[PDB]
Every structure is written in structure tokens, then in C-alpha cells.
Design a binder for this molecule. Structure first.
Ligand SMILES: [Zn+2]
Ligand SMILES: [Zn+2]
Lengths: 225, 225
């Protein structure tokens, strides 16, 4: 597994290291509403059970390849000093995703160019999918990446970054950082059995943002493999 | 409750009457994959637990006001002679929805006209919501309805019809009626406690479609109130 995702952690190791840092900043399972975004696939169930067991109030969103469609309206809706934590993971299977696999094939078949369309457009009978593929097309072009060299892990990875930035857009619209503290933890979900390879973690307490490195957090011996 | 939804059934009564007719056409809990579309709200949980207890394989979608965004890609994905049944319910609370309530207010504030936009467009930071409101705007204009006279039940009701037609679009793209039999059951979910007011029910076995009236199905005395 690590031959693809060096930072991959067993999912319970991931949760413990997350509980450790959050508590460090005044978050508790009882004072925080969490939000999760995952692919619609049945396999994303473990991360989602683990998270809602860690928190009192949980609220989930999901779409193809974990694309974010709930917008500010969906996010503000799912929320009820204020404390939130936002998780987001596209998934992949090694030893899934499905929609990300289809994207890979098409992005290679036609240009990155053919696949891009402006924001605000979408296909009537493929809304989620078309929005998903269009955000990856733009994202790919915006980082001078060649889809010919990319494999499914690197696209699942590009996806995370895209998803991650769109989650950030929504949070700044929906949350007041002067009355609410919050955390953002995103990365890639991996199935063999279940792993999380973290890529981005920070907290915003008192409108001040601090980056965290989960990989530097000493693990609980009990929740390891 | 009935003062708003004459056909409202207790949810277990609804499930029994549904099990009775489906079995009549060769469906069983074990030979059928079901699919459910509901609002993203936490309250829609009972209908969803009841359905997946009735079936071996279940697959769910959901968005604001139960708008359908998974497209043909999401639907074909969620599926695995072939037998399927498709449920769809917007919700409402009497004694929810939230997104439908917001639509009501806006549709009344500006014209039905202002709110319509062509299919294939959507707002970048409100994808689900904007697609939801745009399909209701068009649907409203297409039935000479005046949003000034409409209340939240009638809009939840307009929504059902809209959702219902978009589900039909997807199914004909995604399912081969000559190799697959299927059923479509839609209506409105109501919270006091939990009710379903059915509005559309049919089955398609051997590319032949038969309408069913759940209201004429003799109820199980055991699953009533
Ligand atoms: Zn997936
Ligand atoms: Zn709702």
C-alpha cells in the first residue's frame, strides 16, 4: 500500500491522531459537529462509521468521486462557541473509485482541453459526473499536468486537492471564523483493510489558522496494526 | 395530517402494501436491488431504514429536497433476471424540508420567471440548490401554476412530480426493460410519526407497464396504527 501512498495510516490510527490534535485545540467529541464528504460508493462506510462514533453530532454529504454539490445551502443546513470539523476523502482500491476510473479513461482519450467547460455548466442527465469531470479537467490544466502520465492514484490525488479547494470555498461562505472555530482534514481513503492517507490538516480557532502534521503525532499503540 | 395529504399512510402500512403488490409481480426482498432518493436531511432516516430492512441489496442517493444529481452514471453505478425498485420522496413536517421552504419564499418573492434558467446551468457555489430551484421553476411554469397561491405542501407536491419525472428520464437511459423488470414508487414523506403519501406507483415486467393503486391494497392489520 505504502508503495503508492507513503503517508497512508490505518483508519483507527488516523482517528486517534486526529482526536489527539483536536483536543489540543479545545475540540471534543461532544462540543463539535463534524461533517463528512465521501464518494457515494458503499465501500466508504468504515471511515464514516468511525467518524460518527467519534462525534456526538455528525452530518454527511456524498457524490460521485466525493464531488461537492451541496453548496453553501447544503452546508449551512447540515450545521445544528461553535465548533466544526470538515472531513473529505475520495477513495481508491489497492491490493474504487469507479467514477474516478471513468474520468481517467476519458481524460486520456480526449484532451484535457476537450473535457474542460466553464464553471456553472453541466450535463442535464449527468449532473454530478459532468461537474466532477469538469473540475478535474480545469484543475489538471491549472497545474500543467499531463493526463497521459497520470495513473488512477495520481488522479484520486488530484481529486482530493480539487475537492479540498471546493470545500474551502464553501466554508468561507458558510462559517464566521470570528464566532466559530473549525478544523479541516482531508486526504485519500484506501481499501485493501481500510486506510487514510492524510494530505491536508489545519485548524482555525479565533480566526487564526494553524497547520497540523498528523504524521508527526505519536500514535496510540492500541489503535495501530 | 390527512387534512393535507388524503392518501397519507403510516410508513409500515406503506411498506406492507408495497411488499404485497411487488410479490404479486415476482419481486422478492431477496431478488431485488432497491434504490432510494430522499432529502439530505437527518429526519428522512426512518423510510430509509425500513426500505433497506425490506431488501437484501439497497443503494441510496440524496440531495437538497431530494433533487436528483447522480445522473445515469450514479444510477448505473449503484446497481449490483434483473429486478429493481425505485423509491423517491421529498419530505415535509406537519403537526422540513428546509430547502423546499427556501424555494417557496424565493419563488414568491421574484417571479416564477426570474427563477427559471435553461437546463444545464447552475450556480458554482450552490449547485444542488440552484438545480433544484430551477427544475421547480420550469415545472411550475409548465403547469400554469401560480406560486402566489401555493403553500409548502403544494410545493413539496410539485417537487415530487418533478423528481418523479427526472427519475423516469434516468431509468430509461440506465435500464433495459427487455432484460430487467422494475418498479417505481414515489410520493411524499411526512413527519409528525412518519407517513408516506403515495402518488405514483407502477411496475414494468417484460417491457410492459402496469399501474398500481396502493390505496386499494388491503392493509396488514399488524402494520397499521
Ligand atoms: Zn467511488
Ligand atoms: Zn429536506
Amino acid at each position: 500500500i505504502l508503495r503508492y501512498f507513503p503517508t497512508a495510516l490505518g483508519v483507527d490510527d488516523f482517528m486517534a491522531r486526529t482526536e489527539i490534535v483536536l483536543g489540543g485545540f479545545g475540540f471534543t467529541g461532544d462540543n463539535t459537529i463534524a461533517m463528512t464528504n465521501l464518494c457515494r460508493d458503499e465501500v466508504t462506510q468504515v471511515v464514516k462509521d468511525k467518524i460518527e462514533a467519534a462525534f456526538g453530532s455528525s452530518f454527511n454529504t456524498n457524490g460521485l468521486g466525493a464531488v461537492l454539490t451541496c453548496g453553501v445551502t447544503g452546508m449551512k443546513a447540515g450545521l445544528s462557541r461553535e465548533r466544526y470539523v470538515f472531513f473529505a476523502f475520495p477513495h481508491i482500491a489497492i491490493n474504487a473509485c469507479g467514477a474516478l476510473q471513468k474520468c481517467l479513461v476519458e481524460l486520456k482519450a480526449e484532451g484535457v482541453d476537450a473535457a474542460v467547460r466553464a464553471p456553472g455548466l453541466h450535463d442535464p442527465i449527468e449532473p454530478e459526473y459532468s461537474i466532477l469531470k469538469q473540475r478535474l479537467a480545469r484543475r489538471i490544466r491549472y497545474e500543467k499536468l499531463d493526463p497521459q502520465l497520470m495513473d488512477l492514484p495520481s488522479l484520486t490525488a488530484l481529486a482530493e486537492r480539487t475537492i479540498s479547494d471546493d470545500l474551502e470555498y464553501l466554508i468561507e461562505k458558510a462559517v464566521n471564523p470570528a464566532t466559530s472555530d473549525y478544523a479541516v482534514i482531508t486526504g485519500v481513503e484506501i481499501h485493501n483493510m481500510e486506510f487514510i492517507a492524510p494530505t491536508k490538516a489545519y485548524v482555525v480557532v479565533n480566526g487564526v489558522k494553524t497547520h497540523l502534521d498528523l504524521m508527526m503525532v505519536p500514535p496510540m499503540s492500541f489503535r495501530q496494526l
